[PDB]
Every structure is written in structure tokens, then in C-alpha cells.
């Protein structure tokens, strides 16, 4: 017979992508494959995530949640709170007042949307809104999490009993360092601290080895490109084209820093904020003692200095005494994520702005799919194609969802906000909007990584963004006109939301107090 | 002063043309869904049920339909001589010759039988047990068949044991065999007496339509004029509303499935001597296949065939010889199928359900599923008098995807049969597979799972994940189609292979334990039915 097994995997690049890949494959391949990470020696502006990070990644490695949190100054996230996305003017951390007296805020929480008669609560709310029977906002009507967040309470009790769903804020550099230590000391991953100087390829175009400055020639059978936006393997060596998708999302730059924070005076917000700006938006990612912040913008509508000044003015920062980190984005995805024996992961594969905190998700989703489709040396084209299909569908679906945040904003006060409205929606999201406009649910949820990966953005997520921005169905779900008993049942659900919010706001600890207990 | 809200333009009356399963399932379901806000009428002429009672189903019938109506399982079973179904057992689909109820021997010594059970496939390291079995098969480490290795249900079925204990504790997943005429009469009584559905016992003589092509009323032979705002076509293959009145084209799909006829009867059965099989049998014939659907005291049986390769008399002779029936002294029911689906299931104010909408041969027991799936989608997309085209279009999209997916799965039963002994079995190989199933076969052939399930056990979830990895393995591996090589990831997972060996041992132990402790299907049936 023949032994066609992969014997060595070489990962180009460290950071979250490189060391998540190394730690995950270290577990998945059960010590049958040598794993090498080539990483040259190298601000905690903060990163936000989504709720399946613990189940899909850290639980797989057997690392307890509290253990890694304590090593990366992690905090708790119940939602993204969108501020001033509906009203004009310069950026402010404080929401503007709408005509009805409400503040210009809406939440996109992780909490579950209940249903009555197999119809989500969103649709009973929309019916009352369209029938003049309520003026209440969707997030306040349908999620107890909204009241919890308004009180800055934590998603767990002091005894660590769960109260709500949540994800995490953390220092991404510390996460990468924690995973590097794990891989090197518990999984015998080889860490080569050196610079790559040449990619060697054979007559078939397969990579055979990476040359380093010190003279190493690193043999491998499978190569994972975690080199970032430059895509030194997938784009440069393999010559795979990158698909620019700035025709769907205009922002392409960020300026960021970490801001010391008076947690005792202000408390700690259990959410990421997305604060609308004149040429983009600014994230606020709280952790203990400080929050990470970054102004995402389009350099076609603001210069770097203009964005930095606007970013500094937002928080009252002294530009001459503030350390800034600047990044120029590559927005889009490779034509194919995996070509021959080169698999791209992270920014070398694809990227969108962090408007829904999907960056780390794209990494561990891709790694999960690589392990599912893990090849041998014959590199079955079917394995490669099925992996590539999953990545492109994952990416384009989130790309579309992000575009809707801009396309349905009512703002028209700056060239940037107007320019977004001249872009075209992809067919897939236009279809979802048409379904929504008819009163129908958009991708009902089905509640396993498969199930979540295939039902990622569901009805509640679309309602949070569509209804938050002001896009409503043309009319109520018509089936509701025939269901007086189900309408009554939904009224009980609305009362449950109010009662649950009351109860939990009274009993939960502040996020600040839970963090101090978690971190000592 | 009226407010002028949308909730005032409601459908006020729904008229259902036809009874049977499609008509009375629709009436009963809408009776529940519309909460007495809509008048529901069923127009059904008195009929006499035809010979050859027996229909097989799939496991979500109770959850998705009878549970919705609040009818306990045992209550309706007792009213239609229902029995239990743990699988379809495919007999002689791999070997040549005339039809026989007894399996032929394969080259590997095993009998030519394979099961398609409803039992769940366990996983190790997120990899289904099917793939650990395939790896050992392709590596020469086992000769055991997929169904025997991976499902305890196979051993239970081989012993003809029941899927429940006498105390009604569940032992396995299962579905039902029953008399469909009795099921419909049960639902008729339920709808009329508990839901105020009106049963009009009369024949339709004319469909009245307005200038826009919407149906306004059905005229009946007695002269009554049944006005309505929404019309459900449950008239069967004739499609008297959707095809005849609305002129909606029907898409014949005989380029995917050749069988188009059936000859059926009901065979009295010596349950005391032979016991009762807890499964449907699919017995391969020279020009089709024959179903066996056991119930207490009898089994329904029907030879599905293509009249392009066998005449009615030829099929009747082969069917009768199969069971030793005297063809000249046996009551038969002959049926000609319409295989395919309408271009659109819902046109203007006419919604087609059942055979008026679409049909495939009952090779995977999907007929009643297509009915309550369509009804669930109608209730989800239920209109008002404006008949929003988006609702209609989204409904139609669901029906066409549901249908084509099952059509493809059925075609694969024939396309990957190794038989080449008659023109019928050879002809199947000259047909083309649709792109969607070719993609799935390519995925299977690379060793990958095909549509992993989303539950370790909501109608939406199951509707969008209907045929899953276990189903494809049952049929593909059952017929002899194997991956080109093991799932490549398994070469790197010795601990996971070891974990799967424990699972294989659990399957043996569970089957052994249950075969010893379970009651016979016959004894459970006698208790259920008295």
C-alpha cells in the first residue's frame, strides 16, 4: 500500500490566528502530526466576540473559561449597543434625543427571542407597532437583557450561576500569548522565532518549505497562512486573487487606543458600543480598568489625521499624549481560501470591519472546517472545494448582514452616510429584506457546531438591526389576523420580559463587582 | 369611524375540494390554526374505499400533526388498525431474477437485504459512526454490513420485536403503518364534531372564476354554490382546481423516476404463526418493486412498476406469483401515477395539497409527510384577501425544494442499484442525476458526511434537514456504493477510532439486551387493539 499521511504542518504567523490554529490542530491530530509555527519576534485596543467561543474553541481544548479570562483581562458582553446611527452630527459617546424623547440607541443582544404558536415574539411586537397599539422599541419590548444592560448588571451571579447568554471582551495579544504558552508547553508545538525569506515550491506549485533568515529550511506537507493582510503564502506565493468587496462596505481603516477608565465611578458596561461617527463608527470595548476603542472609517471620506482628530475629540484625548495604532484594512476574501497545500486562516483569508465582532469567529470556524476536511498528501480536490465553499458562504453572509447596518441607516448628513445608500445589496440579502417586508420571519432559529454554523444570523438578529434602524414590515404577519389566542399568549410573554428584567436587575451583581471577584 | 387596519381584509371562508388524507388533514389542521376565525368547508362526494389498505409513514407524524391537534397517539392508532414501523427493509435490490419475498445470497455470503431505520447514529469526536464503519470496511478490518454494525434496531427488527415495551416505555424510534381510509374518516369525525368544519356530501360540477382568474365558488350537483376566499385543491391526480381551472402546468419527472403504475391488494396474514414484522418491506421486482405494509391480521401490498417495461397483466402476474395469489380470483386495485409536481403549488387563491400538488412512488413513505408539511407551510404563509405575492412565492419555493430533494433521494435508490438483469434496471442507469444529488454523491465519495443532522433527537429544523447523513449511508452503503477512501481525518485520530469501537460494542450489547427483553410486535399490537 502507501502512507499518504500529512506528517508536518507549518503555520506561518502567530497572533490569534496562528496560535488558535496551532492549539486546535494540536488537539485534533492527537500527536500524530508535527506542528511548526514560524513567527517573528514582535496596544491592547480590545476585541469583542460572540457566545460560541467557549463551546467551539476553549472547551474543545479543555481550558476552563475563568482560566483564560484571568490571563487576558477579559470582561462580559451581552450585546452590541448602537449609538447615534439614526441621527446626524458629530460623534458623541452620549446618544442624541429622538423626536419622541427617546435616545438614539438600540441593542443587538445575544438573548433568545421566545415564541408563541411557533411565531417569534418579534412578530407580535411588529404587529402592535404597525397597528398603533404600541410605540415601544423592539429591544426593550422583547429582551430582558436590555434592562440588565441599562443597569450595567452582570450576566452571572456572584456564585457564577448563569443569568443570561453572553460573550467576551479581551486583550487579543494576551489571548495569543496564552495559547502560545499552551501549545508550546502542553502540545509540543515547535515555535520557530525567525523571519521567512522565501517560499519554496515544486513543479506542481505545491509549497515544499519555508526558508528563514537564520538559514532554516522548514519542510512541511500542509501550510497554513496566518501571515495577515499580506497573504504571503496564499496571495503572493500561490498567486491566488483577492476579491475586493469595497462595493459592499466602504470602511477600510482604523485608528485605535486603550483608554484608562474609572470603573468605580462609572461602573463597567456589559456590552460593546458602536458609536456612529461622521465617516464611520467607533467601538468601545470595556475591560477591567480601561476600555479599548477604535474609529473605523473610510479613508476616501476622511484623512488619517482627520479621523484621528475626530477619534480624539470623541473621548477628549490629548493627541500629543495619546499612543495611537493605525491599520489599513483589506476588505473582502480570497477567490479560494485553500489552494493546493496552502490553507489561509484569519486576515490572510478574509476580513470585514468588526461591526458585529466576527473576526475571531471566522478564525475558529475556519479551523473547525480544516479539521473536518483535513487532507492527506493527495489533497483530494473535493475536500478542498467543500472547505472553500463553507468559507465563502460564511463570509458573504456576514458581509451582507454588515452592509444592511449602513444601507438602512436613515442618516444622510455626510458624504459617507449618503455614499452607503448608492451601493447595491447582494441578491441574497435583498431576498431576506423582501421576506422581512412581507411580515415573515427571516431564518428562524433551529434551537453542535454544525447547527450554529449553518444558522448563524437568524430572525432575531435581522429584527435587531432592521427594526433598530427603523426598517419595518409593510404590514403585520397576515397569519396573526386569525390567531386571537396566540396574540393573548404573546401578551403574557411581553409581561414575562418585563418581570424577568425587574427580577434580574434587582438580584444580579454589577459587572464591575463580578469582574473584581473574577480577577481579584 | 373604522380604523382601516389590515386585520379586517381577512380570509373569511376556506373551501377544500376533496376528502381523503389530504382533505381532512388540511381541514383539521386549519381548524386548529385559524382558531375559529374562518369558516372551513370540505366538499367530498361519498366514496367506497378501494382494496389494498395500508400506508407507511415517517416518525414526525405524531409530533408535527397529531400532537398539534392534541390527539394522543394510541387514540388514533386504535381507529385505523395501525402498526409500528422501525425501518424500510430493502430485499433483493442488488441481485438478479424474478421477484421473491425471500432474499437472495450475495457474493459475500450475506443475504441481499438492507435496512433504512429511523434510529439515531451516534458520534465520536463529532464524526458519525457510519464513517468509522466505512473506514474499517475499506481497510479490510470488518465484513459486517452497515445496518448491522451501527443500529441496534436491526437486531430488534430481525427478531420482529416491538419498538415499545408492554408498559409503553419507548425502546427505539419508529413510525406507523395504518389504513389511510380509516385515518381520514377519523379526522373527518374530529373536524366535524370538534372543529365545526362543514362536510358537504356532494359532487363538484363547476368552478366559478372572476375576471382576474381567482376562484369565487364551487357549484355542486345539488345546486348549492359554495362561496369561498381561499380554495385548497385536494382532488388528487386530476388537479381539478390547480390544473384544470387555473391551468397551471404539471412538470412530469419521468426523466428521474420510471415507475408510473401500481397494482395492489390486501393479503390476510397468519399473525399467530408468522408474527408481525415491525417494518415496511420493499421487494425488488423485474420492472419495479413491491411494498409490504403489515397490520393486524393482514398486510397491504402493491407492485409499483413502469408500464414502459411491463404491461398491467405482466405486473399483475408477477405480483400474484410473489404471494402465491390466484390472479383470476383476487381483487386488485390498479392505479396510474402522475409523477412530478406542479410548476407552482399555489396560484392566485388556489393552494394544492397532496396528489393534486405533487407525487412520487411510496419508496420512502413520504406521501403523508408531503401533506402535513404543505399544510404547516400554508399556515405559516397564510394570506389575507390581498394574496401578497411574496407569501405565495415563499410557499411555492418550500414545496418545490421539499419535493425535488425527495425525488433525488429516490432516484438514487435505482441509479446505484447494481442490477443490470432486465431492461428496466438497465434503463435507470441511462437517466441523469440532478446536480444537487450529484454534489451529495461526490461529497459521500470523498469520505465526508452528507448533511449532518442538527439534533441529537421544532418542525422548521427537521424540514430544513430532512434527509441527513444516516439516510444517505443507509441507501448508498446498502446498495454497495462506498466512499473511494475513508474520511482522511480518521488517519490522525487513533483515540477517536478507539472511542468508536466502544460505540460498536454498545450497539451489539443494546441490541442483545432489547431482543431479550422486548415484547413481540404481535403481542404489543394485541394489547394496543384488544
From Swiss-Prot, chain A:
Coiled coil: none
Deletion phenotype: Deletion mutant cannot produce thienodolin. Thienodolin production is restored when the mutant is cultured in the presence of 6-chloro-tryptophan.
Catalytic reaction equation(s): L-tryptophan + FADH2 + chloride + O2 = 6-chloro-L-tryptophan + FAD + 2 H2O; D-tryptophan + FADH2 + chloride + O2 = 6-chloro-D-tryptophan + FAD + 2 H2O
EC number(s) stated in the UniProt entry for this protein: 1.14.19.59
Marked site (Important for activity) residue numbers: 356
Positions annotated as active site in the UniProt record: 77
One of the record's GO molecular function terms: nucleotide binding
Domain of life: Bacteria
Cited Pfam families: Trp_halogenase
Positions bound to L-tryptophan: 109, 452, 456
InterPro entries registered for this protein in UniProt: FAD/NAD-bd_sf, Flavin-dep_Halogenase_NPB, Flavin_halogenase, Trp_halogen
Binding-site residues, chloride: 358-359
Keyword Secreted appears in the UniProt entry: no
Residues given in the record as FAD binding sites: 14, 16-17, 40, 43, 45, 48, 196, 347, 360
Note: The reaction between FADH(2), Cl(-) and O(2) produces hypochlorous acid (HOCl), a powerful oxidant. Unlike the mechanism previously proposed for the tryptophan 7-halogenase RebH (AC Q8KHZ8), which suggests the formation of a chloramine intermediate with a conserved lysine, Phintha et al. propose that the conserved lysine likely protonates HOCl during the halogenation reaction.
Record's subunit section: Homodimer. Monomer in solution.
Role summary: Involved in the biosynthesis of thienodolin, a plant growth-regulating compound. Catalyzes the chlorination of tryptophan (Trp) at C6 position to yield 6-chloro-tryptophan. It is also able to use bromide ions to generate monobrominated Trp. In vitro, accepts a wide range of amides and peptides carrying either L- or D-Trp at the N-terminus.
Domain comment quoted from the record: Binding of tryptophan induces structural changes. Binding of substrate to the halogenase reduces the affinity for the oxidized cofactor FAD presumably to facilitate the regeneration of FADH(2) by flavin reductases.
Family: Belongs to the flavin-dependent halogenase family. Bacterial tryptophan halogenase subfamily.
Designated name of the protein: Tryptophan 6-halogenase ThaL
